[PDB]
Amino acid sequence: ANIQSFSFKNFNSPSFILQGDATVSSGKLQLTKVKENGIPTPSSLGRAFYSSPIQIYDKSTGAVASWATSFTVKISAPSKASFADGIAFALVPVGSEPRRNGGYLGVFDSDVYNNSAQTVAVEFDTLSNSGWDPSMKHIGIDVNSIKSIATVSWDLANGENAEILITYNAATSLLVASLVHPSRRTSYILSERVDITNELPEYVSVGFSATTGLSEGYIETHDVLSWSFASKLPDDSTAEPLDLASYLVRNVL
Amino acid sequence: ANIQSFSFKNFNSPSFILQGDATVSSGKLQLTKVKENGIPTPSSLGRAFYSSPIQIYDKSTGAVASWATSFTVKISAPSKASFADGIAFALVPVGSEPRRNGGYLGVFDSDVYNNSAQTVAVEFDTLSNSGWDPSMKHIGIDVNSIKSIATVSWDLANGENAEILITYNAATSLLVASLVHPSRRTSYILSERVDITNELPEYVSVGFSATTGLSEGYIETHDVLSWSFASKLPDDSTAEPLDLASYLVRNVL
Amino acid sequence: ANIQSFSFKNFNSPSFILQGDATVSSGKLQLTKVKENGIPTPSSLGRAFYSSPIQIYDKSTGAVASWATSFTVKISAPSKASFADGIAFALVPVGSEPRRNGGYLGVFDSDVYNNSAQTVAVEFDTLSNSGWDPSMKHIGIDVNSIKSIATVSWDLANGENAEILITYNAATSLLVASLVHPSRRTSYILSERVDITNELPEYVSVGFSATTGLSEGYIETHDVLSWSFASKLPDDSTAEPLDLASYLVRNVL
Amino acid sequence: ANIQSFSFKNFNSPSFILQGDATVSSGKLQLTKVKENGIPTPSSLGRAFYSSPIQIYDKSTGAVASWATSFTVKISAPSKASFADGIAFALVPVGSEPRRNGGYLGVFDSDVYNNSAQTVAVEFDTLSNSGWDPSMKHIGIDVNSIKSIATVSWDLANGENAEILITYNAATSLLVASLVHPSRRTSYILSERVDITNELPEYVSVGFSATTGLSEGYIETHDVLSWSFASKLPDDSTAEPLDLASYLVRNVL
Ligand SMILES: Nc1ncnc2[nH]cnc12
Ligand SMILES: Nc1ncnc2[nH]cnc12
Ligand SMILES: Nc1ncnc2[nH]cnc12
Ligand SMILES: Nc1ncnc2[nH]cnc12
Ligand SMILES: [Ca+2]
Ligand SMILES: [Ca+2]
Ligand SMILES: [Ca+2]
Ligand SMILES: [Ca+2]
Ligand SMILES: [Mn+2]
Ligand SMILES: [Mn+2]
Ligand SMILES: [Mn+2]
Ligand SMILES: [Mn+2]
Incomplete structure (x- = not known):
């Protein structure tokens, strides 16, 4: 079995690929632009990925990997400003470049399924876009389109x-996301x-993508304070879910 | 730091303490009695704990441990029978013996807070007891009483x-439970x-406790198919949450 | 796969089984007796084992476990006294009681192979017993007898x-021990x-055993300052060596 | 604390940086050239590193990392040919390009200490170079020069x-290497x-480097069959050795 994992409580550019306005300051990962006085900047777009590609599956052996990631983010909006646009954890093609800004969170090009996009992402959408978004702020699973295949209302706690x-269990093909x-x-x-083997390539880069709104008052920060990830790829078709117990304690708690 | 962990995909009595009707058969952990023909038995009560006690905290150093557990259970009710009574993951005093049966799930004596009970448990209640239970089937956090301090409705999938x-994060003192x-x-x-250091002793035994109903038709099985646990105790007061990413993959997935 | 592991940088009696003069003081594990003034006591014998039994193999599935343990010991001899008798890491039958004292290190009864002894131990012998010991201080592998099947000279650094x-690799059936x-x-x-499945039972208790000399001037201390252990048991005959890289960093370093 | 780790039992180019004749075939990592008929090629040179840089230390916090790596290699020499030149595990500057071939194993330029080389490597030298090598085949620790600072004779088992x-323990500043x-x-x-912080930069790339002899009959293969690595960087100066017990079982065994 092939295993790859990492856990960062402190960030330093070397081990990460930064795109757009993503930067590392004071040890934390700042995905979007922020003026010197601390206020967020509109029309921003930043992405960051682990410098090592991860093999999601192997076409030859029919083995699919089971993986898990955990991270802490702090989303803050200036006093009288509205929230926009959101951050997303994503699995993208190794060479991938940022996509549309604004409500596309920098990972998708349209709200129409396009298998060739080869991108899967779990988004934390802070602004409802009338064309494909649910009524309020939400968490959603996006599979090759910005229109989530499933969502859940989310009460964002400003600044907290x-x-x-x-997590993704290759045995049940179930992707689960929880926020606290x-x-x-x-x-x-x-x-x-x-069905991951159908929506993504064998190798992907894992990381984040965030964007702020295209208007003067639709802004917010996107600071990742810590990030963990672990992946396990078997040798036969027989999948084996991961040990979250041992994972969180050895990585998150 | 002191660490203790284990992951069982196959059960064998030696490493566990069995009480009541709890037994190990075909490698799975069967908490309640079951007739040879496969049907559950009423008025049953079984418990099982890891043979090694776990230190939840240290009064001398002021350090509190962060831990996580994950397991798979299969709760089945015969065709025309009703569900009862439930199973619970619990932290109990090292020498502890089973308590009241039926709706008390074998871990509590009353629905009134009794700090001296020194027991905390997350229950998966399949029968609503008019005196302290919410309207339907639920998941709840019990702190020294059978009346949960918080609950959430749960749609039990019979036989699935x-x-x-x-998980428990010593830094936020937050206990979280999720079911899928x-x-x-x-x-x-x-x-x-x-506030764990107030509700439990320094050392506890971790395990399960399940009971079936006290009537002819209120029965169900309680099979634990796999179980993981991991605990980390720091050396100073400074708490450190666990790495769930690395935990689940190295233990659950 | 079944996994059991632990790492203690600080000792506390609850999670251990203590026999003889073994005691826990100031957080360290003291295997042999020591007078209040700090000097070792002759004719001492102490043992300590993890409170949870470990399954070395499964006769039904033909699976053999791969395991590893690491610990730090400090062996000190008063100014003008000679070294005796040694400490040993051992795998013994779950119910096992201490055996002969002195040069038998409390784990064996004779220097003649006795398969029924069902004990394997890696010893750090500080006193050469003319009847079965090599010329000088040594590290040796004992399989059901106090006469090691293989040894290596060892220059004990007093007080350091x-x-x-x-480690034990089920794939190569190789047991390796290193001291630094x-x-x-x-x-x-x-x-x-x-061939572990032939020399020991399915379940064993892992721990230490130490003894001091039977004479007024043959003494030394045996303090275990930290201890780690990890075991993995597969589900088929196909053995899988452990990941020492990930083990030491996640446990020893 | 920052952690990075991986374990490969099967190789696939994506997650590695290959230089020279290093290639991935049949899942194994082949560092040096090999003709189609299977025989090794002279004057070869290949290197391979994990695609993610690893932070060995942090100048700001004074924290030094503790790490460990384990791998299996198979060195084979055709029937009537002599062994040359060797393989080495090395820590090199992130952008680093291969160096001198032959007896320099592709990582060093001279047998004279040159701190600016910023390279540390543990070599498995199969050919004695009269100018700086010990009498026979050996394992050695090289710190910014091809003349090892310490060596140990090694009886190479052809084809086995x-x-x-x-391992490297930041607490004792001790680097240990063992071969079996x-x-x-x-x-x-x-x-x-x-003293690692003096011989290398904050970030390094970890991997292998191997070369074959510059003569018609001085050849051998260098196949890496599996590789594990794990690194832990603390937040204060206080170093913490790794858990090799948990590492090997979770990674090597
Ligand atoms: N990703 C996830 N988040 C929360 N609970 C889970 N249980 C299993 N996977 C989970
Ligand atoms: N115990 C838990 N279950 C699900 N998601 C979680 N996130 C953090 N702790 C969790
Ligand atoms: N137990 C052990 N000690 C030292 N080096 C080893 N390499 C493999 N197993 C080992
Ligand atoms: N690198 C290493 N190899 C073998 N035994 C060890 N003991 C500690 N570190 C070691
Ligand atoms: Ca949106
Ligand atoms: Ca109830
Ligand atoms: Ca002796
Ligand atoms: Ca040489
Ligand atoms: Mn959306
Ligand atoms: Mn209830
Ligand atoms: Mn001996
Ligand atoms: Mn050399």
Whole structure:
């Protein structure tokens, strides 16, 4: 079995691929632009990926990998400004370049399924786009389109940490994402079946993508304070889910 | 730092403490009694704990441990029978003996807070007891009483696997529990703050406790198919949450 | 696969089984007796094992486990006293009681192979017993007898830490033990093939056993300052060696 | 703490940086050239590194990382040919290009200490170079020069697997390397203190480098069959050795 994993409580550019306005400052990963006085900047777009590609599956052996990632983000909006646009954890083709800005979160080009996009992402959408978005702020699973295949309402706690955990079990083909705001003791979870070997390539780069709104008052920050990831690829078709117990304690807690 | 962990995909009595009707057959952990023909038995009560005690905290250093557990259970009710009574993951005093049967799930004595009970458990209640239970089937966090301090409705999928994950972060004092029915793509999550050092002793035994109903037709099985656990105790007061990413992949997926 | 592991940098009686003069003081594991003034006591014998039994193999599936343990010991002899008798890491039958004292290190009864003894131990012998011992101080692998099947000279550094690592690879049936005295930059290693399923039972208790000499001037201390262990049991006959890289960093370094 | 780790039992180019004649075939990592008929090629040179750089230390916090790597190599020499030149595990500057071939193993330029070389490597030298090499085949620790600072004789078993483990403990500043030939039950170990923060940069690329002899009959193959690595970087100066127990079982065994 092939295993790849990492856990960062402190960020330093070397081990990451930064695109757009993504930068590393004070050890945290800042996905979008921020003026010196601390206020967010509109029309921003940043992405960051682990410098090592991860093999999601192997066409020769029919083995599919089971993986998990956990990270803490802090989304803050200036006093009188509205939230926009959101951040997303994504699996993209190794060479991939940023896509449309604004409501596309820098990972998709349209709200129409396009298998050739070869991108899967779990988004934390802070602005409802009338053309494909649910009524309020939400968490959603996007498979080759910005129109999520499943969503769940989310009560964003401005300025308070959000602890996220996303897992994929090759045995049940189930992708699950949960978010927790410790400060408020609120928690949200969402799950859906995703045939990964059909929506993505054998190798992908894992990371984040965030964008701020295209208007003067639709802004927010996107700071990743810590990030963990672990992947396991078997040798036969026989899938083996991961050990989350041992994972979180050895990585998140 | 002190660490203790284990992951069982196959059960064998030696490493576990069995009480009541709990038994190990065909490698799975069967908490309640079952007639030879496969049908569940009423008025049953079984418990099982890892043979090694786990230190939840240290009074001398002020360090509190962060831990996580994940397991898969299959709860089945004969064709025309009703569900009862439920199973619970619990932290109990090392020498502890089973308590009241029936709706008390074998871990509590009353629906009134009794700090001296020194027991905390996350229950998966399949029968609503008018005196302290919510309207329907639910997941709840019990702190020294059978009346949960917080609950969440749960749509039990008869005979289908339930993948559970419970975590405790010493930094936020937050206890979170989530349940997923892969077969139905449904998922539930629930969280609440719990001052562990006040509700439990320094050392505890971790395991399960399940009971069936006290009537002829209120029965169900309680098979644990796999179980993982991991605990980390720091050396100073400074708490450190676990790495769930690395945990699940190295343990659950 | 079944996994069991733990790592203690600080000791506390609850999770261990203590026999003889073994005690836990100031957080370290003291295997042999020591007078209040700090000097060792002759004719001492202490043993300590993890409170959870470990399954070395499964007769039904033909699976053999691969495991590894690492610990730091400090062996000190008063100014003008001679060294005796040694400490040993051992795998013994779950219910096992201490055996002969003195040169038998509390784990064996004779220097003649007795399969029914069902004990395997890696010893760090500090006193040469004319009847079965090599010329000087040594590390040896004992399989059901106090006469090691293989040994290696060892230059004990009085009062300086010794970092030990012992591993067993089910695939090569090879047992390897290495000792390092960081302070002196000296290192020793020793390896031998051992058909474990023939020399031990399915379940064993892992721990230490140490004894001091039976004479007024043959004494030394045996303090274990930290201890790690990890075991993995597959589901088919197909053995899988462990990941020492990930093991030491996640446990020893 | 920052952690990075991986374990490959099967190789696939994507996650690695290949230089020279290094190639991935049949899943194994072949460092040097080999004719289609299977015989090795002279004057060869290949290198391979994990695609993600690893931070060995942080100048700002004074924290030094503790790491460990384990891999299996198979060195074979055609019937009537002599061995040359060797393989080496090395830590090199992130952008680094191969160096001198032949007896320099592709990582060094001279047998004279040159701190600016910023390279540390543990070599498995199969050919004695009169100008800086010990009498026979050996394992050695090279710090910015091809003249090892310490060596140990090694009896190479032609065509038989060699299981290697190299560790670095930031607390003792000790680098230890051990080699085992399971087939022969032989084992070798070697250790030396190395002030890493003085010999290497903050970030390095970890991998292998191998070369064959510059003559018609001095050849041998260099196949890496599996490779594990794990690194842990603390947040304060306080170093913390790794858990090799948990590492090997979770990675090597
Ligand atoms: N990704 C996930 N988040 C929360 N609970 C889970 N249970 C299983 N996978 C999970
Ligand atoms: N116990 C838990 N279950 C699901 N998601 C979580 N996220 C953090 N802890 C969790
Ligand atoms: N137990 C052990 N000690 C030292 N080096 C090893 N290499 C493999 N197993 C080992
Ligand atoms: N790298 C290493 N190889 C073998 N035994 C060891 N003990 C500690 N570090 C070691
Ligand atoms: Ca949107
Ligand atoms: Ca009830
Ligand atoms: Ca002796
Ligand atoms: Ca040479
Ligand atoms: Mn959306
Ligand atoms: Mn209830
Ligand atoms: Mn001996
Ligand atoms: Mn050399």
